[PDB]
């Protein structure tokens, strides 16, 4: 009888551009300066002109620098805590985790590299109709020329709940889908020519779309050294990781680290504008505080309040908490609330909507014993 | 520490800068005249024909 | 006018910091074994 603890689902590690390039050990500043091709322009004249010069063109290549500068390692101490007093198999309840803990850690890296990326623009997503916003998508990479081919498109969990529940996947007649894909099931698989991946790394309430062309990785092994005690090559989900165990007669217990080399890279054009991959945000118009009307144990308790807006994204962090009365009970920014006495107080929660304007306020009632 | 020389290696990966494709010449009309030279000023006339009415 | 993007070439030709030639060692009485010691024989007189 055993139950595991719940953990992401991996996605984005193989839907980026991965290891392009594999020689930063023979570059200086371990960056290879990728080069791009010269394109021209012409000129045009006029017949029978007695001015008679030309103007020369010129042919200009461009480049930009890929960098290896991330180092990703999961370390383990183990002082004495082997055998009989901790880990009966060494293989699946310290190996196993460690190499999750790294394949996650991978994933936030890239997820955190496809958020980050300086995007000029956000597109939003009307929850009511949600296809013109993904058309608008599409559009924008149409208008930088943008090949149509290898465009990968991930949604967060709020969005593709919001997908299934638009009526335009919803409703049979609307899509012409005669058994309900977004009904029997709840999943969309295609919309506006893109193949939707569900990811849960990204933020709940956003959708990204990128061409292959669009956010170079770069991964690299760690060389095992001659003089460690114990070396091997593992891998996670398509990258070779180095674990190395080695003793240390001194801290009383042998460690392990389990690591690889890790760089990343926008391809960002040589106007230096990012056009090769577009966001897009759901659409919020208001918020709620989960739970309602609720008590505290002690009067000086601790409770963490939680606001879902309308398409049931968690948004706490990203909004602001306020106390009508605080010689009652007070409210951290964080969402924490602690009383101070006994009684009643109300507590405002406001959140300023990604299509901006004013904040949307929810408010809800607390008795502190 | 130790001083290493190294290359500065240079890569081709298929990043290239982004252009139209290109459509629109295919669908005008092209080289309906092609006699420009015996012309005065480069220029062929086109005649169409009359129409009256009853 | 044109610029180009070229990479700096590094290669080998052959040139090499000049070193001694090894010439003492093997011309030396050498014992592989803490210590050793080593016995003269005695000599007398009539």
Same mark, same amino acid.
């Given at each position: 009888?055993?139950?595991?603890?719940?953990?992401?689902?991996?996605?984005? *590690?193989?839907?980026?551009?991965?290891?392009?390039?594999?020689?930063?050990?023979?570059?200086?500043?371990?960056?290879?300066?990728?080069?791009?091709?010269?394109?021209?322009?012409?000129?045009?004249?006029?017949?029978?002109?007695?001015?008679?010069?030309?103007?020369?063109?010129?042919?200009?290549?461009?480049?930009?620098?890929?960098?290896?500068?991330?180092?990703?390692?999961?370390?383990?101490?183990?002082?004495?805590?082997?055998?009989?007093?901790?880990?009966?198999?060494?293989?699946?309840?310290?190996? +196993?985790?460690?190499?999750?803990?790294?394949?996650?850690?991978?994933?936030?890296?890239?997820?955190?590299?496809?958020?980050?990326? %300086?995007?000029?623009?956000?597109?939003?997503?009307?929850?009511?109709?949600?296809? %013109?916003?993904?058309?608008?998508?599409?559009?924008? +990479?149409?208008?930088?020329?943008?090949?149509?081919?290898?465009?990968?498109?991930?949604?967060?969990?709020?969005?593709?709940?919001?997908?299934?529940?638009?009526?335009?996947?919803?409703?049979?007649?609307?899509?012409?889908?005669?058994?309900?894909?977004?009904?029997?099931?709840?999943?969309?698989?295609?919309?506006?020519?893109?193949?939707?991946?569900?990811?849960?790394?990204?933020?709940?309430?956003?959708?990204?779309?990128?061409?292959?062309?669009?956010?170079?990785?770069?991964?690299?092994? *760690?060389?095992?050294?001659?003089?460690?005690?114990?070396?091997?090559?593992?891998?996670?989900?398509?990258?070779?990781?180095?674990?190395?165990?080695?003793?240390?007669?001194?801290?009383?217990?042998?460690?392990?680290?389990?690591?690889?080399?890790?760089?990343?890279?926008?391809?960002?054009?040589?106007?230096?504008?990012?056009?090769?991959?577009?966001?897009?945000?759901?659409?919020?118009?208001?918020?709620?505080?989960?739970?309602?009307?609720?008590?505290?144990?002690?009067?000086?308790?601790?409770?963490?309040?939680?606001?879902?807006?309308?398409?049931?994204?968690?948004?706490?962090?990203?909004?602001?908490?306020?106390?009508?009365?605080?010689?009652?009970?007070?409210?951290?920014?964080?969402?924490?609330?602690?009383?101070?006495?006994?009684?009643?107080?109300?507590?405002?929660?406001?959140?300023?909507?990604?299509?901006?304007?004013?904040?949307?306020?929810?408010? !809800?009632?607390?008795?502190?014993? | 520490?130790?001083?290493? !020389?190294?290359?500065?290696?240079?890569?081709?990966?298929?990043?290239?800068?982004?252009?139209?494709?290109?459509?629109?010449?295919?669908?005008?009309?092209?080289?309906?005249?092609?006699?420009?030279?015996?012309?005065?000023?480069?220029?062929?006339?086109?005649? !169409?024909?009359?129409?009256?009415?009853?």
């Amino acid at each position: 009888i055993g139950v595991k603890q719940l953990q992401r689902e991996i996605v984005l *590690p193989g839907l980026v551009w991965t290891n392009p390039l594999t020689d930063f050990g023979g570059s200086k500043n371990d960056t290879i300066t990728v080069r791009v091709p010269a394109i021209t322009t012409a000129n045009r004249r006029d017949l029978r002109d007695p001015d008679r010069t030309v103007i020369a063109s010129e042919l200009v290549e461009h480049s930009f620098g890929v960098t290896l500068d991330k180092h990703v390692y999961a370390a383990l101490k183990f002082t004495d805590e082997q055998r009989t007093l901790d880990i009966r198999d060494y293989t699946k309840q310290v190996l +196993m985790p460690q190499v999750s803990a790294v394949a996650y850690e991978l994933e936030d890296y890239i997820a955190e590299l496809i958020e980050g990326a %300086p995007y000029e623009e956000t597109i939003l997503i009307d929850p009511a109709d949600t296809v %013109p916003a993904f058309i608008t998508a599409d559009q924008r +990479m149409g208008e930088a020329n943008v090949p149509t081919d290898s465009r990968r498109l991930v949604v967060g969990s709020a969005v593709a709940a919001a997908l299934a529940k638009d009526k335009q996947f919803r409703h049979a007649d609307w899509s012409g889908d005669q058994a309900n894909a977004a009904l029997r099931e709840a999943h969309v698989g295609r919309l506006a020519g893109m193949n939707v991946i569900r990811s849960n790394a990204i933020a709940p309430d956003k959708a990204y779309l990128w061409h292959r062309t669009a956010f170079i990785l770069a991964y690299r092994t *760690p060389v095992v050294p001659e003089g460690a005690k114990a070396g091997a090559s593992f891998s996670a989900n398509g990258v070779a990781l180095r674990w190395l165990a080695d003793y240390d007669y001194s801290q009383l217990g042998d460690r392990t680290l389990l690591d690889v080399f890790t760089g990343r890279k926008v391809v960002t054009e040589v106007d230096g504008s990012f056009v090769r991959a577009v966001e897009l945000q759901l659409q919020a118009s208001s918020i709620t505080i989960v739970g309602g009307a609720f008590a505290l144990a002690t009067t000086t308790g601790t409770k963490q309040l939680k606001v879902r807006d309308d398409n049931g994204t968690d948004v706490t962090a990203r909004c602001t908490f306020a106390s009508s009365a605080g010689t009652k009970a007070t409210v951290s920014a964080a969402g924490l609330v602690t009383g101070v006495a006994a009684g009643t107080a109300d507590i405002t929660a406001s959140y300023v909507p990604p299509q901006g304007g004013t904040a949307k306020t929810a408010t !809800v009632t607390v008795t502190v014993p | 520490a130790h001083i290493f !020389v190294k290359p500065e290696l240079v890569a081709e990966i298929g990043v290239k800068q982004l252009q139209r494709e290109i459509v629109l010449p295919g669908l005008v009309w092209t080289n309906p005249l092609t006699d420009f030279g015996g012309s005065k000023n480069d220029t062929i006339t086109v005649r !169409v024909p009359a129409i009256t009415t009853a």
